[PDB]
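To assess whether the prediction recovers the assembly geometry, we first specified each molecular entity separately, as shown.
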Amino acid sequence: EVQLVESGGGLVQPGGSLRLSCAASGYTFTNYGMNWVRQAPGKGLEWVGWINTYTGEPTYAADFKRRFTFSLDTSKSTAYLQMNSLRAEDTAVYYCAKYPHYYGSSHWYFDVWGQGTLVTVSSASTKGPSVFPLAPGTAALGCLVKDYFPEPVTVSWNSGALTSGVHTFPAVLQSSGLYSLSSVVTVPSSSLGTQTYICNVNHKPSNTKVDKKVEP
Amino acid sequence: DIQMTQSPSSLSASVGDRVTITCSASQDISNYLNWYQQKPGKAPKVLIYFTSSLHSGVPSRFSGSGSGTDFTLTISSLQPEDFATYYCQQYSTVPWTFGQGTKVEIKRTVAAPSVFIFPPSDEQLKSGTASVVCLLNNFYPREAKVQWKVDNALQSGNSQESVTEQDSKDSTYSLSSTLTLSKADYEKHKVYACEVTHQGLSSPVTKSFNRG
DNA sequence: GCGGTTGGTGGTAGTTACGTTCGC
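The predicted structure of the complete assembly is given in tokenized form:
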């Protein structure tokens, strides 16, 4: 199977540097260019540039050459995007992408994409969330995930065994400059006292893992 | 650089409807135009390439047309799973550029929200803050009005709302409204109520509690 | 059979239509 796996995303201060990696597998690496596309939160798509994976020759859009460098390690089937002098406006999910198996005669399109890696450029410090219970023939219950930076947070219920009726809201940015969200689920009121309900919160950026029993 | 403009920027249509999305280029792009579909928290997925070619795996209800500076994506029979943002992209001249995106919402029958209110947890209160949360669950259409009443006085302007993306199966939305007070401010009031107005409700629904 | 989801050699190029592939 053709796949592109990215890594290297994280929080970095303005003026700082990050190196992203795009690990390719399941095809002849040097037969396809590697493209880089970014998407700012709640925004559209912007092509950063590409690199010929045999010649190593990069082509950058706009002004990216001033600050960004594409490179390769063919012995690892990996492409890199080194970013320097990062600005707030560089906050975005970064994707790598490749053309289709057959791209001849102008069949050029982004056929396979990486999963994306989020780059956040901020002067604000990392902070893990506090996790509070939202206590309950249908009862609703949840967890409030309060005061964290940066994105993202993931929430599961009962280690993924409870999926039906789960709603995890998009985070809101508070005046403080911190994010907060809730995750909720609906259950039968009969099951309160029967089934244990645990919300599992993961905030990778701060290495915060919290399990929370939501009791009636 | 070639500017790509889509029209409309957002649309709503019923299951089975024909939907068209237009893409205009700032100069002739020689049929070098692709369409992508992007669902929440996923990478874009190619649907149509080189103006009119349907990608393997993509349902035949998707088609593309156009030439010169004017292009169209047609969805011949819209399905609930087609909730997504659609993007056109030119590859005539570097840098490659995308349109701004068109958000497609799926119409469905009116569905009133189920409303729930949550008092602040003891856990949060012990830290000196109080968040009161109102949940509106599984409604359509998206517009809903939430008022906060604290001892009959309105505090709606002090709250923050978040709305889920449209569900890709049942086409509904959910909404949270959160009103956060200092522990001190919380303790100077008795009745906390959220009052909900929506097209699915003949009269406002209020959920409330008395502090302690 | 014949268009993609694939394999493999060459190679400074989207490199790309081919065959040894894959899948209706």
